[PDB]
């Protein structure tokens, strides 16, 4: 119904002295006469329209996945009211719709929900690239203000998705804090002049081992909040654990349950003592079983290797995320274990002790780059992807998310069609290609920008370095090809075939 949004906005503008920019022939906004002028700003507004994500990988005593605010675009544009003329007209229309969005027909609510999509939909006319970019920037400042507001509270934002916001509380306080957490987040949301953000804090994690969206060990989600009494089983996608060899995957998962149980037990021990030191005790607790099972597994691998039946299972499945060397996949297992352990800052010394023990188990230098993990993510993401049925706005990560996760969005059961997925992926890819074609050079010593079309080396002593060349764009093209083998993607296949030529 974004065309209805177009006709209503046209009616609203016709009321004012300014006149609509609607143009059926070209869905691009029709401002002035050109409607087609191209410059650096023209590509600037359409591109980089992705929600920035803040991630702090760690393990914490009391973590809450929190409310998980939705439809932040309309909330932000309403809160902005607390070019400028079009902004004021749109703010008045949005306030009118919000008044209609409350205690009225469901059509008003649907129109309010789809207004955000219309603001970003190129197919819908009266769509301005400046409008989309400015709404994106407003959402950026909204996330910044939310972060600042959370900063005042004695809690740290360990993750930020702009769809779900993740904060852990510094204090080791028990169950009563969860009710106190609800009271404090009520107090937090009451303070600013907003009312459109999602309430009902949810999915608190009594323990969380935060790596990324897909690797975590959150426990005891939203409930009567008894602090692990009704312990929800640790939800753990493990997009890296899937990467692993199918035989080493159960071992890694079993040991991460063992690790989780050990840290939990040390957590009750520390809580009883008080009536991350708990993690520090946990480290010494699981050190002996870890080291004993490591060599055991290494000793087994000594004969396990060179077995045609075993090597068929031992081969690491080829996944779009990683390009690391094989490096004895069992060694990959212990390196991944180190990485997931390295989150706890206090235990990092004990983690170093365990690494020294392991390099005694298998010969290797105490500190080594080869011993370093350097896990590749290779996340291919379309900025601010939307599901027309659900109207939710969220970046969709094709490589990292599960095969059905790309297909079906989390909010509503409706599944994304493949054609739009390929269209958006190719959109980002080539848009980056022209960006590569329209960059501005940067010097070596002075580091100025290429204000000169006839430069031939900087007027500074240094030459023009540059920012982002072709080679890793080509490897990204190779990742696109790998996805194309993974997912049919005939439009993507055609795009790849064209790009090769």
């Amino acid at each position: 119904m974004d065309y209805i949004i177009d006709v209503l906005y046209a009616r609203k503008l016709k009321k004012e002295n300014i006149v609509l920019w609607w143009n059926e022939k070209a869905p691009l906004p029709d401002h002035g006469g050109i409607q087609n002028d191209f410059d650096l700003n023209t590509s600037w507004i359409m591109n980089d329209s992705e929600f920035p994500k803040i991630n702090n990988s760690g393990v914490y005593d009391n973590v809450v996945l929190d409310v998980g605010v939705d439809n932040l675009t309309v909330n932000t544009i309403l809160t902005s009211a607390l070019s400028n003329d079009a902004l004021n007209v749109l703010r008045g229309m949005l306030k009118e719709w919000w008044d209609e969005a409350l205690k009225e027909n469901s059509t008003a609510d649907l129109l309010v929900n789809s207004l955000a999509s219309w603001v970003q939909n190129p197919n819908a006319k009266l769509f301005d690239g400046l409008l989309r970019y400015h709404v994106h920037n407003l959402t950026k400042k909204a996330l910044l203000q939310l972060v600042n507001e959370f900063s005042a509270l004695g809690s740290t934002i360990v993750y930020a998705d702009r769809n779900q916001i993740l904060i852990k509380t510094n204090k080791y306080s028990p169950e009563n804090c969860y009710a106190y957490s609800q009271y404090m987040m009520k107090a937090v949301r009451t303070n600013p002049m907003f009312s459109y953000l999602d309430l009902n804090i949810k999915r608190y994690w009594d323990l969380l081992i935060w790596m990324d969206k897909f690797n975590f060990s959150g426990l005891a989600c939203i409930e009567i909040e008894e602090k692990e009494n009704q312990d929800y089983t640790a939800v753990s996608q493990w997009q890296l654990k899937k990467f692993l060899s199918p035989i080493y995957q159960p071992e890694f998962e079993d040991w991460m349950m063992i690790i989780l149980d050990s840290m939990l037990k040390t957590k009750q021990s520390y809580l009883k003592l008080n009536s991350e030191n708990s993690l520090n005790g946990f480290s010494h607790l699981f050190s002996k079983p870890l080291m004993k099972r490591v060599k055991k597994l290494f000793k087994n691998q000594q004969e396990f290797i060179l077995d045609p039946q075993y090597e068929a299972d031992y081969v690491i499945p080829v996944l779009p995320g990683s390009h690391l060397n094989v490096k004895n996949p069992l060694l990959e297992l212990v390196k991944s274990l180190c990485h997931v352990m390295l989150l706890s800052k206090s235990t990092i010394l004990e983690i170093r002790t365990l690494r020294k023990e392991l390099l005694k188990i298998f010969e290797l230098r105490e500190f080594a780059k080869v011993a370093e993990f350097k896990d590749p993510s290779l996340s291919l993401v379309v900025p601010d992807f939307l599901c027309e049925y659900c109207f939710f706005i969220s970046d969709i990560d094709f490589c990292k998310a599960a095969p059905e996760s790309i297909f079906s969005c989390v909010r509503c059961h409706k599944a994304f069609n493949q054609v739009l997925l390929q269209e958006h992926l190719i959109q980002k890819l080539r848009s980056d290609i022209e960006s590569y074609l329209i960059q501005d050079l940067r010097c070596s010593r002075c580091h100025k920008v290429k204000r000169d079309y006839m430069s031939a080396h900087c007027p500074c002593a240094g030459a023009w370095e540059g920012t982002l060349p072709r080679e890793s764009i080509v490897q990204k093209l190779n990742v696109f090809k790998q996805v194309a083998k993974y997912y049919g993607f005939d439009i993507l296949l055609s795009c790849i075939a064209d790009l090769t030529i």
């Binding site: 069609n417 739009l420 006839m454």
Partner: protein, 529 residues
């Protein structure tokens, strides 16, 4: 067959003649060749001599006795012999994409240093050197054509003065050649490899024969006023162009008897029809579909030797749709391309001994994804090969090429490009404080004399850095096809070269395609509906 007997024979034939080394294995090769000679090996001597001469001419390598590469040498020899016992128009007129044309770079030592374009996934992406050298190459071609033209004017006329040498003296007058652009101070700046100077647009008379837009080279005369630091140019003249024949004779023979033979053949050639439908053909409209069907019926009577399909094949821009209407816009774009292939093949004389050339447009995808209504980079991206399917098999003569398409004509040269450059000129025509036919003549003079197809700043329109050689008017074709929907349709000849403007497919209410006879050197336009 009997190597040792051939051993001294082959030694005499090869080693004594050329000092060439033959292995036992290649000598065995010659042995089975003698075996293939059913007759006794007497005239194999001359045969082996011709073998040696061909090997020396082609391979130019030691160790001929390979029997592997030597086997290929034997195959080439028998092909040549078969050609010995047995003792064009389609070879020329080839359609080349933007990247197909060989790259050329200016060099003071060698007037045009040979370069190479790029069909590689890594190769097609331009480089930092490509960034600097596209600008530098425009300037160098401008400088060399200007110095040749100034030699022509007077041993030469007034000479340009290095921007750096300008400011050294305040009140002195100088000749300049540089690229005009807006200075970040706010003034109009003329920029060359030596530097850049802000230009006082006052007291400046333009040359009425040429357009003038930012991002163009220019020959100017005036005072600099080093205290004022802005060049008080008096007279402003676009850099004079050079005729294709004059450019060739200045740069020497490059790829006379062959050219004159091809010219005679083309003059012998008759009724070769070059048909251009016109700008912005739309496959969506049914009335336009019927008009195009009637046009194809007309072309069925005489299949044109050239057919041009213009940009914006679809009526409205095609692009990604997250709010899909259960069917992607790209799917309609594909179906529109698939359609009319049967219509082309339905008419039997049509699409037989014919060629259809397609030009991308802003409404076309890969040119609408970059910018829905607008066009993207200056060398426009052709449609995906997937959208080319079943129309390439139904119609064998359809050619999918980028917007800067060229034809390597045997007696002439034809450059095909579609854009609304007239609108860009009009919105960028400069005012100097100091008619359609006339303005088209001025546009033609501007395009030819400036020596670039689209002399515009890369910021205004993205230009392929490694492909900038094509965007420069290095060849100066005798005939150049430039389709401007905005501009009035016309055909004009300038500096010994003809410029043809197909214009819109339908001017006001009637379909209209051109027809051109290269031998007759005249363009005719018909009307339908």
């Amino acid at each position: 067959i009997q190597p040792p007997l051939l051993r001294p024979l082959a030694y005499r034939v090869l080693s004594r003649k050329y000092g060439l080394s033959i292995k036992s294995d290649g000598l065995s090769a010659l042995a089975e060749f003698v075996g293939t000679n059913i007759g006794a090996n007497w005239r194999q001597g001359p045969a082996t001599i011709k073998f040696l001469e061909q090997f020396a001419a082609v391979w130019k390598q030691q160790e001929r006795g390979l029997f592997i590469d030597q086997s290929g040498v034997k195959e080439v020899i028998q092909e040549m012999k078969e050609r010995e016992k047995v003792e064009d128009w389609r070879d020329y007129f080839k359609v080349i994409n933007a990247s197909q044309q060989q790259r050329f770079s200016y060099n003071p030592h060698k007037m045009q240093f040979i370069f190479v374009p790029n069909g590689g996934i890594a190769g097609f992406l331009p480089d930092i050197e490509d960034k600097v050298q596209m600008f530098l190459t425009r300037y160098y071609l401008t400088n060399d054509r200007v110095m040749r033209n100034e030699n022509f004017q007077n041993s030469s006329s007034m000479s340009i003065t290095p921007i750096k040498n300008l400011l050294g003296r305040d009140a002195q007058n100088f000749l300049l050649l540089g690229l005009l652009n807006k200075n970040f101070k706010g003034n109009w700046s003329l920029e060359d490899p030596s530097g850049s100077v802000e230009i006082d647009i006052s007291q400046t008379i333009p040359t009425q024969g040429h357009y003038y837009v930012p991002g163009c080279m220019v020959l100017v005369e005036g005072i600099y006023y080093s205290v004022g630091n802005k060049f008080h140019v008096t007279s402003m003249t676009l850099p004079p162009g050079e005729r294709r024949e004059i450019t060739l004779e200045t740069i020497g023979n490059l790829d006379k008897d062959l050219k004159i033979r091809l010219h005679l053949l083309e003059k012998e050639l008759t009724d070769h029809k070059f048909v251009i439908l016109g700008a912005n053909l739309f496959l969506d409209d049914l009335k336009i579909m019927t008009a195009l069907s009637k046009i194809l019926q007309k072309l069925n009577d005489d299949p044109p030797t050239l057919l041009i399909w213009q940009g914006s094949f679809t009526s409205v821009p095609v692009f990604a749709s997250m709010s899909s209407r259960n069917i992607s816009s790209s799917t309609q774009f594909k179906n529109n391309f698939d359609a009319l292939a049967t219509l082309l093949s339905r008419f039997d004389n049509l699409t037989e001994n014919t060629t259809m050339i397609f030009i991308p447009g802003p409404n076309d995808l890969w040119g609408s994804m970059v910018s829905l209504g607008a066009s993207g980079t200056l060398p426009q991206d052709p449609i995906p090969s997937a959208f080319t399917k079943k129309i390439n098999k139904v119609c064998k003569n359809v050619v999918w090429s980028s917007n800067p398409t060229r034809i390597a004509y045997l007696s002439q040269e034809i450059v095909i490009f579609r854009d609304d450059l007239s609108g860009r000129f009009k919105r960028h025509r400069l005012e100097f404080p100091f008619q359609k036919v006339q303005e088209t003549r001025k546009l033609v003079k501007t395009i030819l004399d400036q020596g670039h197809l689209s002399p515009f700043l890369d910021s205004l329109r993205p230009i392929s850095w490694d492909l900038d050689h094509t965007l420069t008017l290095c060849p100066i074709p005798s005939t150049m096809v430039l389709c401007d929907t905005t501009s009035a349709q016309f055909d004009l000849t300038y500096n010994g070269c003809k410029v043809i403007n197909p214009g819109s497919f339908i001017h006001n209410r009637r379909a209209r395609y051109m027809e051109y006879v290269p031998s007759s050197k005249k363009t005719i336009q018909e009307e339908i509906y």
